[PDB]
Ligand binder design. Structure first.
Ligand SMILES: [Fe+2]
Length: 186
C-alpha cells in the first residue's frame, strides 16, 4: 500500500511533494524511501569514492526543503559520533551494510560515552534519526566491500558536531561535498 518509486527520479519527485508542506510525516517518508529498490545503474553517476575517507555526493537540493546526498563508504570507512543540527535525517542503504551505533548525549562532565543501540542496516533499509533520538556513528561493516547510502536531511544543514567517545567533548565540523550533481568539487 506504500507508494513505490520505480526509479531514483520517481523517489526525488515524490520527496519534492512530501516536503512541499509544513508537516513531514516521518514514517510515511521512511516507508517510501525504503520502497525504492536501489538500482546502481541509476546512481552510479554519484558513486565517487576516495581511498581514505567516505565521500558526500550531492544529488538534489529539494527546492530548499532538504538535501538528498549519496555517501560512499570505502573498505572499513566510518563516520565519527555526531549530531544532526535539529533536522530530520533519513538514511537508506543503496549497497553494502552500515553498522549504526546510537549513543546518548554527554553532559558537561567528562566521561566515556554510552551506547544505547547497535544494529546493522540491511539492504534497501531506511533508518531515521534526529537530535532527540540520540547521537550516532555509522561504519561500513566490510573491509573487502564498499557501502553506499542515500541520505535526506530536512532542513538542509552543513555544520554539525563530532563527539570524542572517551570524554564526550565535542567539536564543530563543517561538512563538505566531494561532488554535486555528479561533478567533482574543487
Ligand atoms: Fe548521521
Amino acid at each position: 500500500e506504500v507508494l513505490k518509486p520505480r526509479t531514483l527520479a520517481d523517489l526525488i519527485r515524490i520527496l519534492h511533494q512530501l516536503f512541499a508542506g509544513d508537516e513531514v510525516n516521518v514514517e510515511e517518508v521512511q516507508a517510501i524511501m525504503e520502497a525504492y529498490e536501489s538500482d546502481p545503474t541509476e546512481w552510479a553517476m554519484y558513486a565517487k569514492f576516495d581511498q581514505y575517507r567516505y565521500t558526500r555526493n550531492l544529488v538534489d537540493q529539494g527546492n530548499g526543503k532538504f538535501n538528498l546526498m549519496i555517501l560512499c563508504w570505502g573498505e572499513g570507512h566510518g563516520s565519527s559520533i555526531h549530531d544532526h543540527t535539529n533536522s530530520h535525517c533519513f538514511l537508506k542503504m543503496l549497497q553494502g551494510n552500515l553498522k549504526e551505533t546510537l549513543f546518548a548525549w554527554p553532559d558537561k562532565k567528562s566521561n566515556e560515552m554510552v551506547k544505547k543501540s547497535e544494529r546493522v542496516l540491511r539492504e534497501n533499509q531506511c533508518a531515521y534519526i534526529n537530535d532527540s533520538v540520540g547521537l550516532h556513528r555509522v561504519e561500513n561493516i566490510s573491509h573487502t566491500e564498499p557501502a553506499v547510502s542515500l541520505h535526506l536531511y530536512s532542513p538542509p544543514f552543513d555544520t554539525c558536531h563530532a563527539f570524542d567517545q572517551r570524554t564526550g567533548h565535542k567539536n564543530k565540523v563543517t561538512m563538505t561535498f566531494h561532488s554535486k550533481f555528479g561533478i567533482r568539487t574543487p
